[PDB]
Each structure stands twice: as structure tokens, then as C-alpha cells.
Amino acid sequence: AAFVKENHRQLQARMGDLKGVLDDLQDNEVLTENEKELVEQEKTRQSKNEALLSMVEKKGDLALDVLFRSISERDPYLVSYLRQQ
Amino acid sequence: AAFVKENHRQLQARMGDLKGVLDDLQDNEVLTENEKELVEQEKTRQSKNEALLSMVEKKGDLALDVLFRSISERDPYLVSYLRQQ
Amino acid sequence: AAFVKENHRQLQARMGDLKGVLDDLQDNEVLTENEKELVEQEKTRQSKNEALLSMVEKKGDLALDVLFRSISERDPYLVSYLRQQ
Amino acid sequence: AAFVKENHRQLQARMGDLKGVLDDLQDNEVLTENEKELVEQEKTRQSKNEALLSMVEKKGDLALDVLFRSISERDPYLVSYLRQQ
Amino acid sequence: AAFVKENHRQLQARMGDLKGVLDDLQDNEVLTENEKELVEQEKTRQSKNEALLSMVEKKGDLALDVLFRSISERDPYLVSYLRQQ
Amino acid sequence: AAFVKENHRQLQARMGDLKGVLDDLQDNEVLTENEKELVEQEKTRQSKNEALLSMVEKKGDLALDVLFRSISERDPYLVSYLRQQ
Amino acid sequence: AAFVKENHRQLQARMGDLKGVLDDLQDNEVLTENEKELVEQEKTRQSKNEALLSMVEKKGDLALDVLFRSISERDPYLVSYLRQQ
Amino acid sequence: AAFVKENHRQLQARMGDLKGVLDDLQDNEVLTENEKELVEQEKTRQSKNEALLSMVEKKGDLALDVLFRSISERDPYLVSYLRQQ
Amino acid sequence: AAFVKENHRQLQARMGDLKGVLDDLQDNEVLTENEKELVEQEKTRQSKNEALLSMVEKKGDLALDVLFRSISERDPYLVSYLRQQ
Amino acid sequence: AAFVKENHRQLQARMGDLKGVLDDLQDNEVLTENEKELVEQEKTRQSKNEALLSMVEKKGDLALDVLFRSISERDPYLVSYLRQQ
Amino acid sequence: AAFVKENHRQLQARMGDLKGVLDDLQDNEVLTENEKELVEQEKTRQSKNEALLSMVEKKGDLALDVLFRSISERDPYLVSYLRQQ
Amino acid sequence: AAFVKENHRQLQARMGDLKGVLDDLQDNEVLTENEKELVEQEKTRQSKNEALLSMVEKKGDLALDVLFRSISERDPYLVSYLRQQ
Amino acid sequence: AAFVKENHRQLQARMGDLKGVLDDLQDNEVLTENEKELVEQEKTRQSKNEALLSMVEKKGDLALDVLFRSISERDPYLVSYLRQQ
Amino acid sequence: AAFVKENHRQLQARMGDLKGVLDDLQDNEVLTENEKELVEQEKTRQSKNEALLSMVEKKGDLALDVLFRSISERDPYLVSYLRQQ
Amino acid sequence: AAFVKENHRQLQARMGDLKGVLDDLQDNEVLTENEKELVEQEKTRQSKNEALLSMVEKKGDLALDVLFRSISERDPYLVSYLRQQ
Amino acid sequence: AAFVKENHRQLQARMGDLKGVLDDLQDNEVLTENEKELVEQEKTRQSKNEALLSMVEKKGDLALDVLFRSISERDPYLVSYLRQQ
């Protein structure tokens, strides 16, 4: 959960396909449809990553934990890379 | 209802998409169209949160309760995060 | 692993059939099905190579190593050619 | 090895039965089965020659040398004709 | 022309996009550029409607007629709705 | 016509492709080109639905009837679902 | 009909050729041509499945039933697999 | 049924004539004509094997069992070879 | 001409060799070369039938009549089968 | 020329391959390359038809005549169908 | 130059793609980059046309002539249509 | 410098974007930040032009010359138009 | 606390967004809502800074300390810059 | 740090994508979220550059140094161009 | 380097595939990934050319030289054509 | 070279096998591999002809001459037919 906070910049510059994590967050009620659509209407992938990351940090640490779990299963290689550095 | 008052600053710094809560408040007659439009014409999201929060506290505690319910359903994760701290 | 980074342009201009490496990466959980499909829906082979290479560098160096191994077994002649130059 | 590069057009317009060279390249790990099959599924013999030649130049100069050896043994008359002109 | 006067409140609460009527009034010399700009610098749509309506009633009944014509062509459905009630 | 009013929230959360209804409303003079364009320049589909619905309620009940007819032909399944509940 | 809702994620990750179900839905007026085309212009099969599933849930439960019937006849093995788990 | 899953790569690299298994799957309603045709329009035999295998795993484990039976009767030697290793 | 419309699904699932009807339609100016080529570049025969049928219904009923005549002469047995059922 | 105006909806719902008419309009200076590209970047064929039709009506009646001629030669069957109804 | 003034309303309701004329005006020093950007940040095409037209009339008649030339070359059909009416 | 004085009314009714001239005047110490902000807090563009023009005439003729230079470079077309009349 | 007094002019000419400090002062009962509103209704930012600074010095040194703390957290860079000079 | 001051006008007219520098400044506590949002809500890129530059000069020279570093890494070519002139 | 400036309009109307030059500029640190993505998200090829050209002129003349070199190698025929005219 | 321009439509409707001319253009550096691949990924032969012709006209007249030579040798009969008419 904190790991997201210490890795905000790397997560924006590295996270790729957001459809998986967005759907997982939606199904965990972290994000409503409107919130997800707002995330997706950004022009650039770094912009989309910033939108998603900020929207989730504002939700608190529990939701940050849910996001971290969803990334760790949707993209375990990046999570592991960051966590060991 | 009080919970809003003890969490004014956190609610301004955390609340995100206000369209849901604004529409819910409108449909509960807490806010008229003009009031909602005045809330939305602020430049920044913290400014919008301040406008909405102040406009609702002035209405009394019953309306504060309606606002709290609307947040608890539109953004339950932040509500829960705050309530457990 | 680094060797991929020093040879980004050559690898895009030289790598050929990507089905082998894509399947190997999928089976090593570097890429999910969706990610692989996104790689394959590019129009041109240089575009496909760019998509795959960028998608893998973002994953970190461990995944870059997995990709390098998969190329070194799927197309050893190009790997050797580059590595000796 | 270079000789292939200076004679790309002549080699596409002259090379005939590709089964010998394709099998030799396969046994020298220049081409995998999938790569060979992709070469053979072209409609025309000039198309097949183009596919094979491009697929091999991308592999580097060492593989170009292997291809040249295989042609020089599978079709020495054309190789000699070109080399003396 | 009178119809505007008997429907001041409904016209403020119902009229929508004012660009059409403002341009028509400008081209009929009912409003100068400065007057139109003053109408548009109000914060809310009900405020803009009030500004425009008052600014036009002050001009007299002839200008009220011009405004009514411009609404009846720019937004005939609302005009008809009101006129039959 | 009323049915739209009792189902404002459901219609915003359910209505999908608006091109059909927007074109039908345009051809019934409920909406001018400018009004339609203003509806389409919203970021989100719920935002677009809100814009369209509000813009039409302001026009009166006759225009609400036209909108209801256009939905009942462009998307009869949702209309029927709502009407039986 | 509900079965679709409890199996949203599995249905997106499992459903295959959508031409059959799309045509059946079209012939049952669940989807217009435009809606079907919007479903088909997505890049990936999981994206297409998400588009179709969401577009149908919004239509209500009756249309969800029609979709379920069309899947149960177009792809009975997956339907049965899911229903027994 | 599982045996297919543990032997995905070997089954793609080993399975040969698919007409028998495709017809058997068709007659067991695992595959419709359209699905079978989509399998057959791939360029390469490894591509065809991948298409068929993925299309069947998505159908569930029961259909995987049907596919395994059809292979075990259409090509028992490969099945036995794999199963004893 | 109508008979085509009442038998859209059967005609897609039954029509076979389209070269005859495509050439006849071309010679009756129902289809230009480009249109015919677009019909032929579909992957599957049901896809080709759908493309042709839709492309012709859009042309009107006269062209549907021309198509029906061309089928009735190119494949009279299917036409008769359908017409008597 | 008018015929286009009385048949706007039918022309959007019926017109098919637009490459012919777009090229003809380009060569008659009705459309510049940029305008044609803007027409082609729409997602759906009805969207493309709407874009083209609106872009041409705005140009005046002479350009509408040019468009009608180009359709009458590129797709005479639909033109005739509409004109006789 | 005057022709623009007598056709202000038609030019706002008819002019389409403004990128060409905006770039031409920029290269003729009628508009600076900031002015062009201000024109482009309007929401609607009629709004953009109004902004551009007003911004140019204020510049005088010489600049109106430059704008007219740029339209007459970027969109000659509309210019001709208007000029003959 | 005088030219500003003989063209006070035209300059208020014609000058457009003031950001350029305001910044230039600031950098030439004709206006301090406070003075510039006071100019910008007027409601209307004619009001802003009046404020700026009066504030500069009061400064003397040298500052009027600086303002004229800044307009002649920021908006040469209007300057030329006026100067030749 | 004194530091504010020795830096009155610099603090008026440097302090930027006052919303943070105003809210902090309000929550520390240094300023009532009316006082804050009076601060915000000034035209210019230097005027707003003067109003706030004077209103706080009049309150005494304890309130000056509260204001200094709020600036040091809301805008630490300016505070540090001044304090080291 | 000074280099920013001697190049204020060039930096406003040249700086491009501000997302990088804004995020870097945020992470160096030069700018709070509110300040960054205020910078981004300007209409034009020159306006955004002016807002950012002024907001940073007010912070002092240390923050100007941080901004210069962030530009020198986010856009080294422009920095170098200016510094050598 | 200047040659780009004297040929801005021709370069926007002539430059074709931008992937090569964009990648070369990226590898020469003229453009970051975000900048390149912003260039690619434009709708039209002339729009993309304008975005790239403006983004590079702002960087200075050295970067303009890098861009010119990359075009002269990626598309030498157009460069030569322009340079001799 | 011009002859291509006066015969754009005929050349798109007549040119046949493009492999010869594409390879010749590649070997004359008129087209890079990526450009050639982009030409070949069009669906229809008229589309491919349009892509190639436009891509070459943009390159200038020298490249148009190279293309004309390559056609005159790869397909002399069509060239002669057109040139004598």
C-alpha cells in the first residue's frame, strides 16, 4: 500500500495496459464507471497513469492496497522489479 | 452528519468526482440547480469541495446527513478510510 | 538484459517472426493475452517490434532478461550477430 | 556473404527449387520450422525468393554466409554464373 | 412581445443556449457588442437569462418583439410550450 | 413524456449511443446543430446523458414526448424494461 | 439473465466468436447496426466482450436474457461449464 | 482434460492433421462451422494448433476432455508418448 | 426481392460459391469492382455472405431482385428449397 | 442537388463504400485532402456518411450537385431506388 | 473584403475546417500564435467561426481581404455559392 | 505616439488580445504588475482597452510611443489600417 | 512571528495562493468567515496580501506566529528564501 | 537560476509540455496540488507558461533553480539553445 | 536547419510516415516519450506534421538540424526535391 | 513524371501487380521497407494503388519520374496505352 506511494513516478512511467487494473478496481468498488471513464479519457498513457494513481491515493490506504494487489496480479514483473530496488 | 464536520479539511482534500454527489443532493432538494451551478463554476477541485461543503453545512445537520449518505454510497472507500482514523 | 537496451533499434529492424517469443513471454507471465493481442494488432513488423520492445522494457530488467533468453533460443543467429559487434 | 547482398535481385529472379536450401538452413538452425513454412506459403516463386532472402539478411551476415554455402552446393551453376559477372 | 413579460420567470428558468439569440439581437441593433459581452460575463445561466431579459425589457416593446421572434426561431419548442399554457 | 421525468437517473445511467436520438431530435427541430454539438462535447457518457436530458426537459413536455418516442424506437429494450418497473 | 451478471469476468475472458451472438441480438432488436458496429471496432477480443456485455446490461434484464439464450445456443459448452460451477 | 493444459506447447508443436479432430469437435458441438473455419484459415500448422487449443481451453474443461478424447483416438501414438513423460 | 429479406439468415448459412453471383451483380452494375473485392476479402464464407447480403439490401429492392434472380439461376436448388418452406 | 437534402437520413443509412465518391469530390475540389481524411477518421459507416453529407451541404447546392452526380455514377442503383419513392 | 461583412452569418454557419485558413492567416501575420490558439479553444464550430470572424473584422479591411483570399482558396465552393446569391 | 491620441476610440473598439502588449509594457517598465492586474480585472474588452489607454496617456508621450511600438509589432494589421485613413 | 514584520513588503509582493493560509487561519480562529471574505473581495493580489497582513498584525504577535506557521507549511520555499537574507 | 530571469520571454514562448516540469516541481514541494491546478487551468500555452514562470519567480531564487534543473532535464535542447546565445 | 523554417508549409503537406523521424528524434533526446505520444495522438497527418514541426522549432535551431538530418535520411527524395526549388 | 499526375485515376484503376514496382522503388530509395509494407497492408488493389501513388507524389517530381520508369518497364503496355490518348 505504501509501496505505491514510494513508487509514484516509476508507476506512472512504467504501468502499461490499464484495462485490467481498471476493471479490477471497478469490481472492488474502488472506482465507479464514471471515475473509470474519466481515467480513460486522458490523451497519454502517462496522463492516464497519473489520473489513476492520484484518484486512488485520495481514496485512502485501503484502496491503495487494493490497487497494489491488482497490479501485482495483472503485472507481477514490474511490481517485483520495483519492490527489489 | 457530524463526521463531515470533523473531517472538513480531509473531505476537501480527498473528495474527487462531485457529479454524483451533486446530482444526489439536487434530487434530495438540498441544492437547487443554481446552487449546483455555483458549486461547479469554481476553478479548482479543492475550491469546488470547499464551496460544496460550506454550502451544505450552512443548510444544517439534516442536509449534512444527506450529503454524508451520498458520499458513503458514491465513494465508500474514502468514507470508510476516514471513519476508521 | 542490457544487451536489449543497447540494441533497441537493431532489434526492431531485424526481429522477424514474433509468434515464438510472444508465446514464450506469455508462458513466463511477462505478457498477458491482452498484452500479446495488443502487440499483434499493429500494422507493420517494425511497429510490432517497437510495441513489444517498449512493453517489455517498461516491465523492468528481469523481464528484459526473459525476452533476451527467448530471442536467443528462437533466433540465435541474430542474437549472436549483434552480440559480436 | 556479401555476394548475396550485391545479387539480391538476380537471386530472386533466378533461384529455383528452394526445398534443398530451406532444409539446409533448417538443419543449420538459421530457420525454424515455422519460418520455413512461412516462406513456403507464398504464392509465387519470386515471392518465395524475396521472403527467404529478406528473412535471411535480417539474421545477419553469418546466416547470409550459411545461405550462400547452401546455394553454392545446391545450385553451383547459378552461383558461379553470378560470381563471374 | 407581451408574452415575454407574462413569462419572465419561465423564460429565465428555461432558455438555454443564448448564443443564437444574442447574435440575432446584435444583428438587429437591439444589443451592441458591449451589451452582449456584459450579458455573457454572468456566472450562471439563470443569471445570464435575467440579464438578457431585463436588458431587453428596458429597451421597450419593439425590442421585446424582436427578442421574441429570435427565440421563436432559435427555440420554437419552448416558445410553443409556454404559449399554450 | 412524464416517463422521462420519473426516470431521469435511470435514463442517464442506461442510455447508450446518442447519435440516433440526437439526429432524430435535430430533424424534429427540438435541437439545433449548435445544441447537439454542445451535447456531444461532454467528456463522459453520463455527462452527455445529463446534458441531453436537461436540455430537453427545459424545452417542455411536447419535446420530452418527442425524445421519448425517439428513444422508444432507437432503444426499445431499455424503454420497455423501465416502463415495466 | 442474472447468470450473465454473476459471470461478467468469465464471460469476457471466455467468449470467442461474437458474430453469431451479435447477429442474433441484432435480429432480436437488442442492438441496432450502429451499436453492433461500435462493438466490433474495438481492438481486442476482451475489449469487444466488455463492450458487448456492458451495452447489454444497460439494456435491462430482458435483453440480458436474450443475450444469454443466444450464447447458450451459439456456444453451449461454455455456458454449461460456467453454470455448473 | 488437464493433460491438454500441461501439454499446450507440445501439442501445438506435435499435432498434425487437424481435419479429424476438427470434425469430431464439430459433431460434438464443441465447435460450430464458423469456429472451425476460423481455425483453418491460419497460415501455419503451429498457428492452427494454437488457434484450436486456445479456442478449446476457453470453452472449459468438459470441452477440453472432448478434445483429448478425439486426439487420443485420431492420434493415439502422440497422446501416449506425451502421457508417459 | 422480399424473399431475400425473409431469408437473410438462411441465405448466409447456405449460399456457397459466390463467384457466379458476384460476377452477375457486377455485370448488372449492382456492384463495382471495388465493392466485389471488399466482399471477397472477408475471412469466412458466412462473413462473405453477410457482407454481400447487407451490401445488396442497402442498394434497395430493385438490386435485391437482381441478386435473387442471379441466385435463382446460379443455385436454383437452394432457392427452391427455401421458397417452399 | 435538392434530392440529397430530402434524402439525408436514407443516404446516411444506405451509402456504402465512400472511397469512390470521396476521390471524385477531391478531384472536383469540393474536398481537400484534409477534409477527406477528417471524413475517413470516423469510427462507423453511418458516422462517416453523416460527416460527408454535412460537410457537403455546408458547401452549398452546387457542391451538393457534384456529390449527387458522383453517387449517381458510383452507386446508381441506390440513387434510382430513392428517386422513385 | 466587404463580401465577408455582408456574409457574416452565412460564413459562421457554413465554414468548416478552419486549420487551413488559420495557418494561412498566421503566415500572413494577420494572427499570432496566441490569437490562433484563442480561436481554437472555443467549444463549438459556430463559436470558432464567430471568434475568427470577429477577430479578423477588428483588424480592418485589408486583413478581411487576406481572410477572404484564404477562404476562396481553401474552400472555393462555398465562396462561389455565396458570391452568386 | 500622437497616433494613439488621434485614434483613442478606434483603438478601444479594435484592439484585441492585450496579453502581448501588457507584457511588453511591463517589460519596458511602463506598467508595474499591479497596474497590469488592474487593467485585466475589467469586465469587458472595451473596458480593458479604455483602462489601458488612459493609464498609458497619463504616463506621457514617451510611454505612448512605447505602447504604439508594442501594438505595431503585436498587431501590425490594425495599426497599418488605422494609419492609412 | 517578528519575521513577518520585518518582511511585510516582500510578503505582499511574493505571497501567492492565499486559499491555503486563509483556511488555516480560519480553522485556528484567527479569522472569522466575514474577515476572510473581506480579504478575498480585494481586486488585486497585492491588495489581498496587504489586507491579510494588516488584519493579522492587528491581531497581535501570537496570531502573527500562527500566520507564519501556515505560510511555512503552505509555501516553505518563499519562507526559507526570505529567512536566509 | 538567474538564467530563468534573463530568459522569461523566450521561456514563455518556447516551453512546451509542462506536465513533466509541473510534476517535478510538485515532488520538490515548490508547488502544491492547488498551485499546479491553477497553472493548468489557463487557456493558452503562453498563458500557462506565464503563470508557471511568475508563480516560481515569486518563490525566490532557490525555487527558480529547481525549476531550471527540471527544465534542463525535461527539455535539454531548449535550455542549451538559450544558454548559448 | 533553416531549410526547415523556409519549408514549413511544404513539409507539413508532404511529410509522410513519421515513425522513423519520431524514433530518431527520441533517440537524439530531442523528444521524450510523452512528447512523441502527444505528436501521435493528432487526428490527421497534416495535424501531426504541424505538431511535430512546431514542437521542434520551439526547441531551437540545433534540434531543427537534428530533425532535418533525420528527414534527409528517412525521406531523402522529398528533402532533395524541396532543396532544389 | 507529369504523366503520372495527369493519369492518377487511370493508374489507380489499371495498375496491377505492384510487387515489381514496389521492389524497384525500394531499391531506388524512394520507399523504405516500412513505407512499402504500409502500401501492401491495404485491403483492395485500388486502395493499394491510391496509397502508392499518393505516397510517391508527395515525394516530389524526381521520385514520380522513378516510379514512371519502373512502371514503363514493369508494365509497358498500359504505359503506352495511356500515353497515346
Numbering used by the authors:
A (entry chain I), B (entry chain M), C (entry chain E), D (entry chain A), E (entry chain N), F (entry chain J), ...: 451 to 535
Please give the exact wording used by the authors of the publication that reports this structure.
Despite being included in the construct, no UPA density was observed in the CARD8-CT cryo-EM reconstruction, which instead only reveals the central helical CARD filament. Given the predicted 17-residue unstructured linker between UPA and CARD, we proposed that UPA and any residual MBP molecules must be flexibly linked to the core CARD filament. Like other CARD filament structures, the CARD8CARD filament also possesses a one-start helical symmetry, with a refined left-handed rotation of 99.1° and an axial rise of 5.2 Å per subunit (~3.6 subunits per helical turn). The filament has a diameter of ~80 Å with a central hole of ~10 Å. In contrast, the type II interface is substantially more extensive, burying ~490 Å2 surface area per partner, and the type III interface covers ~230 Å2 per partner. Because of the small type I interface, the filament structure looks almost perforated with visible gaps. Detailed inspection of the three interfaces revealed many charge–charge pairs as well as other hydrophilic interactions including R459 at type Ia with D473 and D477 at type Ib, K509 of type IIa with D525 of type IIb, E507 of type IIa with R464 of type IIb, E479 of type IIa with Y527 of type IIb, and E483 and E487 of type IIIa with R495 of IIIb. While the wild-type protein formed filaments when the bulky MBP tag was removed, seven different point mutants, one at the type I interface, four at the type II interface, and two at the type III interface, completely abolished filament formation in vitro. CARD8CARD did not form filaments until 15 µM, while only 0.25 µM was required for CARD8UPA-CARD filament assembly, an almost 100-fold difference. In the model in which the type b surfaces of the CARD8CARD layer interact with the type a surfaces of the caspase-1CARD layer, the charge complementarity between CARD8CARD and caspase-1CARD is apparent, especially with strong negative (CARD8) and positive (caspase-1) patches both mainly at the outer rim of the filament cross-sections.
